[PDB]
């Protein structure tokens, strides 16, 4: 059993891989609030996500190298998925390019950031 997550903040979409989601699920079993840092390999950018106990994301921000804020986003939508299929169906309907749908479909494992088209 796994849980996939997709977060739309500003006009960007953020894909959260299952393994990370399970780590947050365990952390929130033991605490009330979680601040997770996510590394975007492709663009070499770092982002800090704040989750409540209900696993919605409260705030999204772009971080520097000393956990510093460069840009703040407004969370618009948070969506959860029980299997890869429902994730793929959402991706195909996402307002992204085929090159972005190709990336999200092949890399469930990594923190991925794509832009709205």
């Amino acid at each position: 059993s796994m849980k996939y997550m997709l977060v739309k903040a500003d006009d960007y979409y953020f894909l959260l891989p299952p393994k990370d989601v399970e780590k947050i699920e365990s952390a929130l079993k033991s605490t009330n609030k979680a601040v997770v840092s996510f590394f975007d390999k492709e663009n070499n950018k770092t982002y800090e996500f704040t989750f409540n106990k209900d696993l919605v994301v409260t705030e999204v921000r772009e971080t520097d190298k000393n956990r510093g804020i460069i840009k703040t986003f407004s969370v618009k939508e948070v969506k959860f998925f029980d299997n890869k299929e429902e994730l793929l169906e959402y991706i195909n309907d996402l307002p992204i390019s085929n090159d972005d749908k190709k990336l999200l479909s092949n890399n469930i494992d990594e923190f991925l950031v794509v832009k709205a088209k």
Partner: antibody
Amino acid sequence: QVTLRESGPALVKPTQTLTLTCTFSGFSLSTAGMSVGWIRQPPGKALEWLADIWWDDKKHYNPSLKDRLTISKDTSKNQVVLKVTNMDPADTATYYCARDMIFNFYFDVWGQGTTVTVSS
Amino acid sequence: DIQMTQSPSTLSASVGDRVTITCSASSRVGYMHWYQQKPGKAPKLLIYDTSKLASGVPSRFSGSGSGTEFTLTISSLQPDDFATYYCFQGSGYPFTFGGGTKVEIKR
């Protein structure tokens, strides 16, 4: 392996409607990411993509064959149907169906193609 | 709409030569895809995602490129390599092919 075979008439009177049928095997158009598309090639000319359908029932068409293309799928029959209205001699070509995937926006496997001539 | 100019239109090379074909796109494209069509037969995927060999295609074939300039290469040209080659993009609808490149063997 994955096999795709196209079937349809070899002769179509002008202004009539061409109906092609792609019967595939080795995959399901119900599996997520899976897609099937149609591509044609007039005698001695370059390939032109025509249409495609996806597992989510999303359909895309070449804006050049406007108001003339319609595609559907029957996952039980494992086949895809393409309908082209108002057939014309410029549409005489070999018609090919092929598989696509959201994972790879390219046609990895093709059918043998069916030749269709528009003539009175 | 992404249009694609393939070059040369025709090419004659001896067996063992190194053949290079170029695809120039009308706009930036993430990946280029190459097909080989012998005459009367259906296209066969040769190189995918710009530089990836399809399964069962000889190592003699390779691809390179980025943005709007892409290339397909044959290290040692073999007699069976007679065909027309097509660069294809799936990065944006409508999907479009190149004009094709006819590769003839000189003997």
